Amino acid sequence: NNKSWMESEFRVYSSANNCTFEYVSQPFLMDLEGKQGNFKNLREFVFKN
Amino acid sequence: ATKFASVYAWNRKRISNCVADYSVLYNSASFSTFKCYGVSPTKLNDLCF
Amino acid sequence: DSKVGGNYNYLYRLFRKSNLKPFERDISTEIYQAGSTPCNGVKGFNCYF
Numbered sequence: 001n002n003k004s005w006m007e008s009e010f011r012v013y014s015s016a017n018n019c020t021f022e023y024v025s026q027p028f029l030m031d032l033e034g035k036q037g038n039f040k041n042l043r044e045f046v047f048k049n
Numbered sequence: 050a051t052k053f054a055s056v057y058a059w060n061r062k063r064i065s066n067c068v069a070d071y072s073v074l075y076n077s078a079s080f081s082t083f084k085c086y087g088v089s090p091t092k093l094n095d096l097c098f
Numbered sequence: 099d100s101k102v103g104g105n106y107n108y109l110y111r112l113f114r115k116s117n118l119k120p121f122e123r124d125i126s127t128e129i130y131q132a133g134s135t136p137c138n139g140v141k142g143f144n145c146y147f
């Protein structure tokens with residue numbers, strides 16, 4: 001019933017044993033509310049190694 | 050550091066995504082001995098690791 | 099040319115101000131100022147023969 005959306009489960013991995021690289025940018029906030037309607041924001045990403 | 054580990058369980062800490070300013074390290078005369086076995090001590094500022 | 103106690107009669111120029119000339123000769127024993135500090139006398143910290 002509560003209009004709240006927050007991170008609750010970090011169900012991604014079990015062990016991070018021998019790490020080498022970490023990248024952390026400055027803290028900020030993003031909207032986790034369940035926005036409805038037609039898709040307004042368009043995000044285009046390109047990855048290459 | 051306030052307390053160092055001992056030789057039986059020598060602590061190992063990682064260095065990443067930094068600029069390793071060896072100038073202050075080498076110029077600090079508080080150290081007793083300083084011996085590099087692989088490369089010339091003065092040139093660590095040039096060859097990137 | 100070898101002795102059980104170590105034939106230390108043989109030496110080499112470990113330090114010099116720069117690269118040498120072709121067929122260059124030098125018997126200099128002047129202490130090299132390895133550290134940024136000026137070096138006087140004949141010995142001292144970071145003063146390498």
Ligand SMILES: *[C@@H]1O[C@H](CO)[C@@H](O[C@@H]2O[C@H](CO)[C@@H](O)[C@H](O)[C@H]2NC(C)=O)[C@H](O)[C@H]1NC(C)=O
Pocket residue numbers: 017018
């Ligand atoms: C990163 O660390 C892990 C463990 O801390 C290394 O994996 C170990 O490798 C040794 C010998 O290769 C094995 O005897 C251990 O059983 C391994 N332990 C684990 C948990 O895997 C791993 O080799 C390290 N990575 C690198 C690149 O050195």
Ligand SMILES: *[C@@H]1O[C@H](CO)[C@@H](O)[C@H](O)[C@H]1NC(C)=O
Pocket residue numbers: 001002
């Ligand atoms: C909403 O949050 C409050 C406080 O965290 C909690 O008491 C309540 O039960 C929550 N809503 C529902 C429907 O459980």
